[model samples]
Target: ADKNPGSENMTNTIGPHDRGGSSPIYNILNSYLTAYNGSHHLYDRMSFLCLSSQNTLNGACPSSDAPGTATIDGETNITLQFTEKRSLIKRELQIKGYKQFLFKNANCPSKLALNSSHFQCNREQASGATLSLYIPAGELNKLPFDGVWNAVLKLNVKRRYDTTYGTYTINITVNLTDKGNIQIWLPQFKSNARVDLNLRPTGGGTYIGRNSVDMCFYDGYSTNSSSLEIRFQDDNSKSDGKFYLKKINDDSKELVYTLSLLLAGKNLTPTNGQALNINTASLETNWNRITAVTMPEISVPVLCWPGRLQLDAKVKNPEAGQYMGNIKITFTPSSQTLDNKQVEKNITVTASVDPV
Candidate 1:
């Protein structure tokens, strides 16, 4: 105690800088799983947005017979439920040489023991923990009767360390239902990869079209080797059939625009052999070739947690209402050429109508 007698007694400085003697220092690791691993900054960059349930694959609105419920014009709140085990093991969120692992109390940063709920040092917190995120129906008030809106779910992970050059693998598990909506964002790594992908509704949300009209992207030159991606999940009713697009300006002088019809994989029932085709097709036909592509309108809805476009082995109208699912459009070279590689990307689509 006398060693720092001259150091202001090490107590009266500025608001108890050291609340606890020493917190446990553990290694960190993380992973994120979603429906479509495309068109999302968080999904592509390996970071999560705490409050985004749509992107997190955390099951958006629950069905009448499901564990959760999101009603219209009502005070509906759904728990972004999840399980976190192995909280002791963590992945340091990294950059060109940056990394971090954050154990959020959701409640606070306290001086309790790691085992204590206040300290938050659990494997469930370490392995794959659940954050009870709330999605207020209030966000829907901005929607028009015939307008389309995106329900996004994001999960963010921060590392407590850094790395310059290396490769890493992460897995994020998502659980959803066949009664909610789904949409995932994909990020571009290079100059062309960085663009805005907007999906609009056609036929009153039954069909949709994805347009790259407002696309935009910029490299975080300050941060090296950051990535963005969206993965697809198949656990719902309908499935994405195809990604058909057309050019806005048929003339050379017209504004160069591209759009396509997005089908909900959740709504389309798959044949027995189609499961492999569904998965492979999802990866193969997502990205469209720049040379030969067109745009048009179309859309459906089937429910699931992580929303991405792909054919699921489920039923569309399990009972009798409407369902929603994700959509994808992919492109590849029909001939062997330097520019004829397969390009894939998925879009969120819904298949729904008034029940009669």
Candidate 2:
């Protein structure tokens, strides 16, 4: 019940939104979630957007049907990050030969009819002297892992003495997990127009966890994130405490061995397996306490399965043939997602006696 956070209705957008205006505003929102809490969010999905409505290119741009690249400016990198809900993320972009914007003072500075100013507020300061306009934070946060969004500005380009007033496009695309970076291209204002701009993840937006998945834990170390398995965890304990007896295909000859008893931690079980010596050892102990398991199988990533396991095995049987046995464990995660079934794993043991 506490593992899943998917269907939670509390994940809605918490920032800003706008409607039709002189800027030809478009709104988009997406949820960013990691499978494992304290690990990282999972995501590798790709998305694309076209700001044809916002493009006011002097000679018009490629038809809205085509996914044209924005080369108006230099090829650039722009990555956005988020820490909490309603997080603020802003990046600055510059435009060469940029003169001014269409709406700033009347919107941002001060001095516009209260009613009209509301709509113009978003266009922002018409300045590429430091090129002002860029996308909003809430908008970028909702983007799929591998996604793209197109935005443009209605500003003037300084060409000689007369200023050419028009709008141009800006296209951006997020890369793969391995290359957790972004590429943004701007429209060329003129035949030889060029603007060099660079953008990157400047905060906690670092590329750590890229996929939307989670991992399990054994003791304290993380296990697999795929299917659940009963991992044998005696590796940290004494080597003899829990050993294996595997059958090597053609290892010369046969050998000896066997088991004495089996226990689960100090809450040990009463006597517990057979033929070679005291093999066929198996036991199950149920308690009322909570146990931890990582679950990336469904929406939930972490949970308490209410269980624990500890193995205690002793072997002795001078030289004889050879003996092989297996210890098995089954884990049933509390609550439900893909069905309330139990997943199990096994521990195989082998003993070859060679007296000196």
Candidate 3:
């Protein structure tokens, strides 16, 4: 039944078709592949990535089932590994195509980089490759809040054998553990130091005194950089409260006094801090005897870790009477800390003047 003598030699040539048709070895290979394909897919289902390295200040990385979890701060540099598989080489496989990576997140903003070039079959040396994700301390301190953060990584890979090629992609989800928050404190004005002035009558002229106060910001979670925004807002001003202060008495005659506020070494006369002065006509609306000044209209730079705002106030034309007022400083933080969107503080300022 041997039609051609060359048919036997053709079967032994061992080319692309040398192993398939009616070969006992081919049948055995097909059975194993059929069962494996039925039970599982070709792509690795379980996550092969692990958060192996982290910043020392971020405590320890937590253990997870597949896609491992880790605790990270702003300075935390996360290292993830893509474990190597033996099956890649067992089938004489050579992943000889280009590879790409993708990163996705909802809460925190991040960036990623790899240590090596595109993954090749034997070039990997069995240990696999690693990815480094960084969320700089400056970016970390600016977290708006704290909670369970989620992120994903997509890996695209291609396989080739002779002239045939196959492409596949895998997605891995990573969860970040958080146990930190953002906080601010006004030690000098609130719980530490208070400023008082006793206006004295030297002549029929004005008596003025210049003093400074400070507002400091702190991070309760880790050491990182954050941004602080300073502006002025008056409940009575309709034009966005360009000026927030006003006279207190109308029937008893309006007292003549002027308060000049400066921030970061700038006078509020018209340049930077001057635009936030309280309205002189509406200061009596609040019957609390003293009203706090809130600066929410100007612009200021965002500082990092343990930052402070130096506030200087100049009192002018003090009348022959007792007067009191309050200064309120509101800080809006842009960082990754927990629930530290904004914080407000008030300082009581009193001035007693003698008749000139």
Candidate 4:
């Protein structure tokens, strides 16, 4: 006997189909395939057919196995009917554009081990044995040391009926666990802070751009104690933490409200897009208590400038838009020391370019 790979008769061990984990569903095969590799592949198996009410670019789409109008033939066959059910499930996936999906035509034994490490290919023994699955948005397939994952569906098509399972088709859903990151990075610069419109426009149609900065934080819980402080930088192009703080009782005691300098937006000049280091300090340690005070006034400033930014627009706007760009403020812990442990985040800043 010769070993024939990619043969329908032969058992093919294809790698697991990895969908970016964290989502509920893994839509491996969303669309129909014209190239049915049937003669030697699963593609060649059972007549490839489709029926859809929707008009596609292609001439025809597969129809549902369920009859348009089911009738009762007392002695012919038993049909389980569901009344008032939605016709078909439609969805869209946000893929990174560069990825691979594979299907295998192999025989899967009744008892198979399909773990994150090794998965088995499914099989349909008879004709008209249909399989339909939908991938929802946290099922991912964790890559194993061997880097192989697969799944199996024991499908048995029937001419009339299969006594054990009957005429109904079984829909099996499996959630595969995968990993990817969605990160938004804003620079730490002084020039990225406030937009200074030298002269305000009078006409309502004339737009003036507002300086915007977006800030965000991840993995913050209610149990964590955090403090926040902002200090205005001086003309020397350096942070001025001592200019505002006064000793509570003694001349020697350090100021309780300390400031951190984060170069969120920067310019050669000191007055560029600079921000007071927004810190999350301890609210209370005796009992698990964390307080987060948001200075919407400073952190997220309103666009008083007209024609530049609109009220409906949000952060992350495209270039050449009327409004100033959003500056994302992300708070990250600086150190572990008690007094100087949590330093303010340092970021690049961008200046407003809109003069209109």
Per-model RMSD to reference? 26.0, 25.0, 21.1, 20.0
For candidate 2, report its TM-score: 0.22
Q: How well is each residue in 189-260 modelled by candidate 3, as lDDT tens digits?
A: 434345554444444464644345544433221222233454433343244323223335433322222334
Q: TM-score of each candidate?
A: 0.15, 0.22, 0.35, 0.21
The digit string of per-residue lDDT tens for model 2 on 66-185 reads 132321222111232222211112232221121111232443333211001112236442221212223343343343221122222222222212222232233322211101111000
Model 4 lDDT per residue over 122-216, tens place: 63331112222233343222222111222222222211111222121222222121111111112223233343222233455333322333333
Which portions of model 4 show Cα errors greater than 4 Å? 1-61, 64-214, 217-344, 347-356
lDDT minimum window of 10 residues, candidate 4:
302-311
Q: In candidate 1, which residue ranges exceed 4 Å CA deviation?
A: 1-128, 151-155, 160-356
State the TM-score for model 1. 0.15
Candidate structures ordered by lDDT, highest first:
3, 2, 4, 1
What is the Cα-based TM-score of model 4? 0.21
Q: What's the true lDDT of residue 165 in model 3? A: 17
Candidate 3 TM-score versus the reference: 0.35
Q: Please list the C-alpha lDDT of all candidates, in the order they appear.
A: 0.22, 0.24, 0.27, 0.23
